[PDB]
Symmetry: C2
Subunit: 88 residues, 2 copies
């Protein structure tokens, strides 16, 4: 029977299901492909995303959580800067 | 005392004699990073290409100090999460 899954960001569960790169991270609702091209960019490289690529649930969560931190950083930054601009 | 402290960031005044956890100098360290809360503010001024006169007896209400403390805490969870996942990407 067993057809078998492999994380593009680490390794192998004969599969808590594995995600395509078009899967959306929840906080921004942008594709998890876009979060991977963000991290590639943070270290001055290209990535090649085959239409094969899947993600373990662990990695999908890691990437989700990063995007989530990145959102709640950008929003609390605006709350605080717009406060700085204000009077009394 | 007679004790009248004014918040640099919201303008709340507190009038004392007093209380528990109360107003903070701009040298008070933010917990999860230990930059001085003046640095956190100089950072926020940069973000809107302005800068600030931190006049030398300035003060912060707890709530504002909490709020800057937590921004600092988020930025640190960005610093460390990002070292991890890019390092992960380098493995191939
Ligand atoms: Zn596909
Ligand atoms: Zn994985
Ligand atoms: Zn305040
Ligand atoms: Zn002082």
């Amino acid at each position: 029977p067993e057809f078998m899954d492999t994380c593009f960001f680490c390794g192998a569960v004969d599969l808590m299901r594995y995600e395509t790169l078009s899967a959306k991270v929840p906080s921004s609702q942008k594709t998890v492909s876009l979060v991977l091209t963000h991290l590639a960019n943070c270290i001055q490289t290209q990535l090649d995303l085959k239409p094969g690529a899947r993600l373990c649930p662990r990695c999908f969560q890691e990437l989700s959580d990063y995007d989530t931190i990145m959102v709640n950083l950008m929003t609390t930054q605006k709350r605080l800067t717009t406060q700085l601009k204000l009077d009394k």
